[PDB]
Amino acid sequence: NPCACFRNYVPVCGSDGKTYGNPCMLNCAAQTKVPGLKLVHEGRCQRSNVEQF
């Protein structure tokens, strides 16, 4: 199961511009929510005053 994930926070940024809580969760989304979703970089997606402070 791609969506069998723990919630441990290992933030990664998807090609959809959405942060995923960990790579497992990105994969879950890749398999069920966002076709073609890829992990583009480690850490949260960059969005000032939203994802960062």
Per the structure, the count of domains in the chain is: 1
Residues in the chain: 53
DSSP designation for 29? H
Partners of residue 42 on adjacent β-strands: 12
Full residue range of the structural domain in which residue 13 is found: 1-53
Phi, then psi, of 19 in degrees rounded to 5: -80, 135
d(CA 23, CA 48): 22
Here the tokens at position 38 are 């890829």
Q: How was this structure determined?
A: X-ray
Closest alpha carbon to 27 in 14, 43, 9? 14
**Residue 50: CATH number of its domain:** 3.30.60.30
**Nearest 10 degrees: Cα torsion 30, 42, 13, 29:** 20
Q: What stretches of the chain show up as alpha helix (H) in DSSP?
A: 23-32
Here the tokens at position 33 are 């929510």
H or E element in which residue 39 lies:
strand 39-42
Cβ neighbours of residue 23 closer than 8 Å, sequence gap 6 or more? 10, 12, 39
Give SS3 for 5.
coil
Query: To what resolution in angstroms was this structure determined?
Result: 1.4
